[PDB]
Design a protein around this nucleic acid. Structure first.
Ligand SMILES: [Ca+2]
Ligand SMILES: [Ca+2]
Ligand SMILES: [Ca+2]
Ligand SMILES: [Ca+2]
Ligand SMILES: [Ca+2]
Ligand SMILES: [Ca+2]
Ligand SMILES: [Ca+2]
Ligand SMILES: [Ca+2]
Ligand SMILES: [Ca+2]
Ligand SMILES: [Ca+2]
Ligand SMILES: [Ca+2]
Ligand SMILES: [Ca+2]
Ligand SMILES: [Ca+2]
Length: 92
RNA sequence: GGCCACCUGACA
RNA sequence: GUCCUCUCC
RNA sequence: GGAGAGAGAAGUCAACCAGAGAAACACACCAACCCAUUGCACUCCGGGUUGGUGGUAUAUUACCUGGUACGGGGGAAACUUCGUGGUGGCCG
């Protein structure tokens, strides 16, 4: 897929509560660059997933390459660039 | 007088 | 206290 | 969204009005398990089981206290006590 500011992440342990997953995710990714926001929803269609929006595309790349299959809550993280831009980035 | 169904009516 | 419709704001 | 109206589900109730007045059911939210989901979103939001919490339900049907229209006693009388849906069927 085409590199993007946001990285789509799935195959995350579904049992983890929303705020906690969101905090861990931030910690693990901060090192790659500033993070404008992190979307996480536990709804039927969105659970097990999360988009992490980076201020700089380059950051999304390193993070993607660096954390592919990383052990997170006992499940290897699957990461890809987001198909389209997230509002925040588009409306900018 | 109970008990089940239904009927009508009250409540909503 | 749900749900449907109608009117009005 | 909010304010009325109508009809109405579930559920409680039974002449009737008034005062007190729960429960039941419906709906909402929370938690814990279980089932399902590998899902690319940016308007929240899958199902199920237990338990819990909530509402101008601050409601009203039981119950209670007053009387009311009929019926039962007693009393000359004043009055004082008792009983109050329709149909079929089943349990003495
Ligand atoms: Ca920060
Ligand atoms: Ca309304
Ligand atoms: Ca009914
Ligand atoms: Ca019933
Ligand atoms: Ca009252
Ligand atoms: Ca009450
Ligand atoms: Ca499974
Ligand atoms: Ca599939
Ligand atoms: Ca959109
Ligand atoms: Ca949603
Ligand atoms: Ca939520
Ligand atoms: Ca319940
Ligand atoms: Ca209740």
């Amino acid at each position: 897929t085409r590199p993007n500011h946001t990285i789509y992440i799935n195959n995350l342990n579904e049992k983890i509560k929303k705020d906690e997953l969101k905090k861990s995710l931030h910690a693990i990714f901060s090192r790659f660059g500033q993070i404008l926001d992190i979307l996480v929803s536990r709804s039927l269609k969105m659970r097990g997933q999360a988009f992490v929006i980076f201020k700089e595309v380059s950051s999304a790349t390193n993070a993607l390459r660096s954390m592919q299959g990383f052990p997170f809550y006992d499940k290897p993280m699957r990461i890809q660039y987001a198909k389209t831009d997230s509002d925040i980035i588009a409306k900018m």
